[PDB]
C-alpha cells in the first residue's frame, strides 16, 4: 500500500510528577489498541485521574489535552498495590476510546474522543519540531521527575518507619532523621536532580538505626 491512516501524534496519559506516559506512539497505523497496567502514586489512594494527552513532550502540560475522567471506589491500599488497566482503542474511523479498570474492585470508567479532536496539520508539525528542539531539556525533566518520585516515596516510607519505631528510636537519631527529611522536602521542590539525590544520601546516613528497627 502507498497510503494508509495513522494517528499523527503519540497518545497517552499524565502520570505521577506531571510527565506524559505514551500508550500509542506517533504514526501508529489505525485501527490500533494498547493496554497498560498502572498503579497508585501514594498509600490509601481511593481515586485516580486519567488525563488523556496528545503530543511528543515529556511535560504533560506541554501536550494537547483531549479530555479526562476519574476512576473512584479503589479500596485504600499501599501505593503500587492496585492494578489499574488503562486501554487506548482507536477504531478505523479515528474515534478514540479510553478506559480504566481497577482489577480488584471491577470498577471501570471510560470516555469517547472524536476523530476531529486534537492538533491540526500545522500544530502537528510544530509539536514534532518543538519536541526535537527540546529533546535534551525533556530528557532532563523526565530524569528529574523520576528522582522526585523516588524522593517523595522515601519521605513517606521514612515518616511511616519513624512513627512505627517510636520509643525504640533514640532521640539523637530521630532529631537527625527529621532534620534530613525537611532538607529532602525542600530539595524536592527544586529542579536540581543531584541536590535531591544528595539529600536522599544524607537521610540514609542518619537512618541506620531506623533501618535496624
Amino acid at each position: 500500500v502507498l497510503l494508509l491512516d495513522v494517528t499523527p501524534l503519540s497518545l497517552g496519559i499524565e502520570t505521577m510528577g506531571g510527565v506524559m506516559t505514551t500508550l500509542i506512539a506517533k504514526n501508529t497505523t489505525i485501527p490500533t489498541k494498547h493496554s497498560q497496567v498502572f498503579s497508585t502514586a501514594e498509600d490509601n489512594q481511593s481515586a485516580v485521574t486519567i488525563h488523556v494527552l496528545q503530543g511528543e513532550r515529556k511535560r504533560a502540560a506541554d501536550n494537547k489535552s483531549l479530555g479526562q475522567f476519574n476512576l473512584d471506589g479503589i479500596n485504600p491500599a499501599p501505593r503500587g498495590m492496585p492494578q489499574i488497566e488503562v486501554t487506548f482503542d482507536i477504531d478505523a474511523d479515528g474515534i478514540l476510546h479510553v478506559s480504566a479498570k481497577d482489577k480488584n474492585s471491577g470498577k471501570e470508567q471510560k470516555i469517547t474522543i472524536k476523530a476531529s479532536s486534537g492538533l491540526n496539520e500545522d500544530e502537528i508539525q510544530k509539536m514534532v519540531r518543538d519536541a526535537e528542539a527540546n529533546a535534551e531539556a525533556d530528557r532532563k525533566f523526565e530524569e528529574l521527575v523520576q528522582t522526585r518520585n523516588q524522593g517523595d516515596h522515601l519521605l513517606h516510607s521514612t515518616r511511616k518507619q519513624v512513627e512505627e519505631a517510636g520509643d525504640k528510636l533514640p532521640a539523637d537519631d530521630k532529631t537527625a532523621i527529621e532534620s534530613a527529611l525537611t532538607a529532602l522536602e525542600t530539595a524536592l521542590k527544586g529542579e536540581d536532580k543531584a541536590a535531591i539525590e544528595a539529600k536522599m544520601q544524607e537521610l540514609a546516613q542518619v537512618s541506620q538505626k531506623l533501618m535496624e528497627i
Binding site: 496519559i13 497496567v37 481515586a47 485516580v48
Partner: peptide, 8 residues
C-alpha cells in the same frame, strides 16, 4: 515496575 497515577 508499573507507572503511577496521581489523584487530582
Amino acid at each position: 515496575r508499573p507507572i503511577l497515577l496521581p489523584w487530582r
